[PDB]
Design brief:
The chain has about 100 residues and is mostly helical. The protein has one domain. It is about 45% helix and about 0% strand. Helix 2 packs across helix 4. The termini are far apart. Its main location: secreted. It is found in: Secreted; Host cytoplasm; Host endosome.
């Protein structure tokens, strides 16, 4: 419907409250694979005035050790919305994931 249900779920991610090696990688994993989920996650952190240096050390730890390549992909949704990007000098990759498989 048009109505918008509002609730308080701070026990889903809370990267600013969660700290661990594997425990973190696991939380980020589902947040990097599940789109329908990450959609509410990437927006959740920002809601709590999260910092890139934070979500980065979290997601990155879950992804490769190359400054988290795919980390900026699913996270781009935020950096793009706020328009405050400009951390790294440059980065390249393949846009195959974007293309469908039909």
């Amino acid at each position: 419907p048009n109505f918008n249900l509002a609730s308080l779920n701070e026990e889903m991610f809370n990267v600013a409250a969660l700290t661990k090696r594997a425990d973190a990688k696991k939380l980020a994993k589902q947040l990097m694979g599940n789109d329908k989920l990450a959609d509410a996650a990437y927006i959740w952190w920002q809601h709590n005035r999260v910092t890139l240096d934070q979500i980065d050390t979290f997601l990155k730890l879950a992804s490769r050790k190359t400054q988290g390549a795919k980390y900026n992909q699913i996270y781009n949704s935020y950096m793009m919305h706020l328009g405050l990007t400009g951390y790294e000098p440059n980065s390249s990759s393949v846009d195959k994931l974007a293309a469908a498989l039909e």
